[PDB]
Amino acid sequence: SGFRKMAFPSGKVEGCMVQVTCGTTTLNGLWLDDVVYCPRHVICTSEDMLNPNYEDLLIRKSNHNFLVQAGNVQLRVIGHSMQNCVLKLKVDTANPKTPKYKFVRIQPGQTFSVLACYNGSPSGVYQCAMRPNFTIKGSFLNGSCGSVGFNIDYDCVSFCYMHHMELPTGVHAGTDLEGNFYGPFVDRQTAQAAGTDTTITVNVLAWLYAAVINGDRWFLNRFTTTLNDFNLVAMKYNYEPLTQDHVDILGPLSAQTGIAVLDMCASLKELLQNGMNGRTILGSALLEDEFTPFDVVRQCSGVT
Amino acid sequence: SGFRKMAFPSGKVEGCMVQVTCGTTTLNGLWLDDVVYCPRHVICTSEDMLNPNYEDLLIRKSNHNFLVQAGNVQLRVIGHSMQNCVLKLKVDTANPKTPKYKFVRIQPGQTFSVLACYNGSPSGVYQCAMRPNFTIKGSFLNGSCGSVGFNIDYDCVSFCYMHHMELPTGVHAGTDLEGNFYGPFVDRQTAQAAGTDTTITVNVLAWLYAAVINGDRWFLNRFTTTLNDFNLVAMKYNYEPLTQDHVDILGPLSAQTGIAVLDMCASLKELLQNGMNGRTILGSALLEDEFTPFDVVRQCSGVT
Ligand SMILES: *CC(=O)N1CCN(Cc2cccc(C)c2)CC1
Numbered sequence A, B: 001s002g003f004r005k006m007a008f009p010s011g012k013v014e015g016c017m018v019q020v021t022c023g024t025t026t027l028n029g030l031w032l033d034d035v036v037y038c039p040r041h042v043i044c045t046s047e048d049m050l051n052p053n054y055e056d057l058l059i060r061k062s063n064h065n066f067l068v069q070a071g072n073v074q075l076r077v078i079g080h081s082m083q084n085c086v087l088k089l090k091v092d093t094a095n096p097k098t099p100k101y102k103f104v105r106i107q108p109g110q111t112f113s114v115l116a117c118y119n120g121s122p123s124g125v126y127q128c129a130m131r132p133n134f135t136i137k138g139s140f141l142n143g144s145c146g147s148v149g150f151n152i153d154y155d156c157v158s159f160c161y162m163h164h165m166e167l168p169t170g171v172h173a174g175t176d177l178e179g180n181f182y183g184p185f186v187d188r189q190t191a192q193a194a195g196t197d198t199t200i201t202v203n204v205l206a207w208l209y210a211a212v213i214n215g216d217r218w219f220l221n222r223f224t225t226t227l228n229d230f231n232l233v234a235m236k237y238n239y240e241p242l243t244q245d246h247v248d249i250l251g252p253l254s255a256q257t258g259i260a261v262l263d264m265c266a267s268l269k270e271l272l273q274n275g276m277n278g279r280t281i282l283g284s285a286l287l288e289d290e291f292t293p294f295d296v297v298r299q300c301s302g303v304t
């Protein structure tokens, strides 16, 4: 029993982190096989960051200008290329700690673990969600860029995020491992405002299911609703619209608890309309939206 | 910027987890050098758990009855002993992945990471605090026993917790790695109620400092207080008394922010007396007490 904001064990990713230095700029890289992936802004001075021409800046860089250190051992760079907003550095040595891996581009509302790193060294691990506005609410200081987000399926790491940017509002933007930004963001020191941070409705409902499974049941009421009726309330409260696909995805939690998805929708409706009245659910005084239905099943079933 | 509930990277501990099976009971063990540490209740049937005599039960067990598996490789048990509520299994092979380590017995209010494991396999990592009633609010299913809590100082893992028990109220009890329970709990299926779960005041104040550093400042007010005056309010709200030792420990956060500890006490006082009025601090609608002053400094300074 108990329900915690839980990250994947980070060991397999820890074994992949390196330091990348180009001139005076140091950030983190991800060493998989004989390729080191890092943000392309490693090649910039902060002077460059106002309006960098990455293709022009990269012409001035040779393989020997990319200093790649894995622990206290230097890797030999034998090629480099830009793919979107990441650099790929070819090294002469396959990472012996390379796990089974994939590169995935996640959807908004999907959760992942971040291994925060500085100078190629792991500092901590936490759980994030890709927000509906394609930002993430992370914990990233200067030097953290190139830190990655991932999911683990038994022995396979799916890398979904690399950290590139802090918006002036203190939220985070980054890329998949093909170097494509989530959302409309660019690796430029410019006016970039996030859109509406809407609540991930399917995640809240999953977490209400997690609450019932763990004995927090005070919010269960006598009501039901319809998708259309619920969605009128969701709109009013900046909640994502709930789709039949979302209902289908909650089916297993519905089955385990015997609470129909639309009945749990009606509980959520009353919580939105009435608030918590100073009560808590799984130790929270607000509705948590950074657990997926898959996350709730996993934590409630104990998958390794 | 941003502030997250952050666990230590778990790789060094992942390399230490094994499966221990005694007859039909399987839980987790911690393999350090040539010793596997696990809860002594591995030797019980659930029949035994009402009033087990561990010394008598252990007489019936030989080295060959303790099946220890590290990945899919079996370890040879060459000795076994009971120390308090843990078994120490001597194996013929030093764990090659043994990190620099210590065993520490933590104080209430201290935070640590848990690597939740099932059948010797890591499932997830989260951050806990030893509560003032010597319980922890964890996420532990059947098979999770022998999962450990730890802190990391650069390259040294300090193991502070092993998971043994769920109280009927769904909170968690366990031992240090000398097998001494935190609090008054016993490894017996009996009536064991937790005392008052008081709020860790010094941790709340640290997290208010973390909020100010990260731009959440609405709760800062025009007031100060005294330790004695604050402590009258702390008592009323089931907050731990604040000591001058706590004030001394907050000194660095005081210095960084230029907010006197007693001024931040007066902010906390008004928050206790007035509530959040539907506002949030670092994405929370309640006062977070599972970050130590050391944790706030680390996350705010980026230690690896
Ligand atoms: C994440 C990290 O380490 N950072 C330090 C370098 N910064 C460079 C930068 C890139 C893109 C936009 C801006 C404004 C700055 C990024 C943060």
Ligand SMILES: *CC(=O)N1CCN(Cc2cccc(C)c2)CC1
Pocket: B027, B041, B049, B140, B141, B142, B143, B144, B145, B146, B163, B164, B165, B166, B187, B188, B189, B190
């Ligand atoms: C943590 C875990 O894996 N558990 C399964 C075995 N249970 C045995 C037990 C020990 C002490 C008290 C009780 C009531 C049960 C513990 C939980």
